[PDB]
Design a protein around this ligand. Structure first.
Ligand SMILES: NC[C@H]1O[C@H](O[C@H]2[C@H](O)[C@@H](O[C@H]3O[C@H](CO)[C@@H](O)[C@H](N)[C@H]3O)[C@H](N)C[C@@H]2N)[C@H](O)[C@@H](O)[C@@H]1O
Ligand SMILES: NC[C@H]1O[C@H](O[C@H]2[C@H](O)[C@@H](O[C@H]3O[C@H](CO)[C@@H](O)[C@H](N)[C@H]3O)[C@H](N)C[C@@H]2N)[C@H](O)[C@@H](O)[C@@H]1O
Ligand SMILES: Nc1ncnc2c1ncn2[C@@H]1O[C@H](COP(=O)(O)CP(=O)(O)OP(=O)(O)O)[C@@H](O)[C@H]1O
Ligand SMILES: Nc1ncnc2c1ncn2[C@@H]1O[C@H](COP(=O)(O)CP(=O)(O)OP(=O)(O)O)[C@@H](O)[C@H]1O
Ligand SMILES: [Mg+2]
Ligand SMILES: [Mg+2]
Lengths: 253, 253
């Protein structure tokens, strides 16, 4: 295929409406509400942008999505039960700052009873603890691991992975930041640029983002240290912020 | 937190057994099989490598875990009811090649009745169609998606995401090859190197990987330009292999 074509918000929107009409002809009374999320729902959609949408079903245990292309453009429509969506909107995870911005950006197209605010609010009312736990997990389950792989790279190679790991790591810290600050990033592309602006940034972070953002990830000696510094900027940050991981137990269970 | 320290197979293996015991004292007869995977499992383990285990159980409602650190080390145990896991062994996703290697790389430490083979038989007893659909989905849900992005980037930005995007693309096309060649990667760091060793490469990938593996991601113009070609490489390749998706319908449902 020729890939994604240039379109206009106006064109995009007609599609939105076309699809909306189809959802209702098909499900009818089973449809509770329909929304536009992403760049479009934000009204910041670019020329090559896609259309993501989310639909709220009456129908229980409902969880499906329909994603397609016409060669020229692509669409994605997710359908959920009113429950399934709420629960989901209530989940803070390692990529929450990436995933959950979708709940504060909905562009309502059809609501039979304010389902869309409900959603938003729910997303909006997350307990602080939840975010803490999520930072903690992210460290054990993620940062730690990368730490290992990068220390082995030094040791036994390969550095052909170094450029890719760094990015992963650059990202990881950003989710770290966001979970900390209860922020969701605009898009996936604004992630680095927005993370590097926040306040209580771990020592070594910005410097790493430098590398990752400039594209100069060719010198593995340097990249090695940054990761190193960052990790240390982290051990600290955690202490001072209270996200202290339980190391104690050799056998957690 | 000192982060992963230097270990040896002996050390590792020592914990594995200790772990092996808690599980046995802890779940006893509900434990059908305990095994080891990862770098350890193959014994390709390194100084700073981690521990991955997996245990099968008779319990119906089984699908839980335990990941932890002590400050210098990480362990990761996965519990599953044989049904669930088997089921998962035969699940081909866009990332099956990164992921499914686990089902092959097993190091059996305990097994009441060859469950660890069933799982292996199962993982390798997956249908070509299944992989055929995997490919189609990637392209749409992903490839096509990355295409607009790098496009929009060419027109509005931002370049600070170019590097990172490119890595994403490279990973994915790699997924493509594996799914193409019922291949699985040993590990994460070997993905690329290994992938580019394949035959039927889509026109463009190799070059593209060279930038990612090298870290010479500073050149914008040169990237987008190496990405587009890749895209076109795809367009051809799929037509050659028959990874063809029907784009006739504007609204396919
Ligand atoms: N063996 C597979 C890996 O599975 C889990 O890892 C974590 C996932 O990766 C996380 O996902 C995050 O990181 C991904 C890249 O890994 C990104 O794509 C994603 N956007 C991020 O949110 C997810 N949220 C939690 C989960 N614990 C294990 O814990 C880890 O030990 C292991 O290595
Ligand atoms: N907006 C989020 C995206 O959600 C789905 O996309 C897909 C996920 O992204 C995939 O995950 C891949 O990307 C991860 C992150 O890099 C990698 O860790 C992983 N190895 C990859 O397989 C997953 N396997 C299938 C799923 N359909 C939508 O289809 C797509 O429209 C949208 O863009
Ligand atoms: N795994 C995931 N990755 C990225 N975004 C995710 C996501 N889970 C949820 N989201 C949300 O869903 C949206 C997905 O749209 P994307 O296709 O990633 C690009 P976009 O940010 O909408 O802008 P664009 O269309 O102009 O490129 C994100 O903006 C984000 O709010
Ligand atoms: N997202 C994912 N990333 C990496 N491996 C994944 C994975 N999902 C499943 N796996 C599988 O589970 C294993 C866990 O791998 P990791 O813990 O990330 C490092 P490793 O491949 O064991 O080598 P290493 O520890 O010496 O660096 C992998 O070898 C892979 O086969
Ligand atoms: Mg979008
Ligand atoms: Mg490992």
């Amino acid at each position: 295929m020729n890939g994604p074509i240039i379109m206009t918000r106006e064109e995009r929107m007609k599609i939105v409406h076309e699809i909306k009409e189809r959802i209702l002809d098909k499900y009818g009374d089973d449809v509770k509400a329909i929304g536009v999320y992403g760049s479009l729902g934000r009204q910041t959609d670019g020329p090559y942008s896609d259309i993501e949408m989310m639909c709220v079903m009456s129908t229980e245990e409902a969880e499906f999505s329909h994603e397609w292309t016409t060669g020229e453009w692509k669409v994605e429509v997710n359908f959920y039960s009113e429950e399934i969506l709420l629960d989901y909107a209530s989940q803070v995870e390692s990529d929450w700052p990436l995933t959950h911005g979708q709940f504060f950006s909905i562009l309502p197209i059809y609501d039979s009873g304010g389902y869309l605010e409900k959603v938003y609010q729910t997303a909006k009312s997350v307990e602080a603890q939840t975010f803490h736990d999520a930072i903690c997990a992210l460290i054990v389950e993620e940062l730690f691991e990368y730490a290992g792989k990068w220390r082995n790279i030094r040791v036994q190679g390969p550095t052909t992975f170094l450029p890719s790991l760094t990015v992963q790591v650059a990202m990881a810290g950003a989710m770290l930041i966001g979970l900390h600050h209860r922020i969701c990033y605009t898009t996936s592309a604004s992630v680095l640029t927005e993370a590097v602006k926040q306040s209580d940034l771990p020592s070594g972070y910005d410097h790493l983002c430098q590398f990752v953002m400039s594209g100069q990830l060719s010198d593995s000696e340097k990249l090695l240290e940054s990761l190193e510094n960052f990790w240390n900027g982290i051990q600290e940050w955690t202490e001072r912020h209270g996200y202290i991981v339980d190391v104690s137990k050799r056998i957690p269970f």
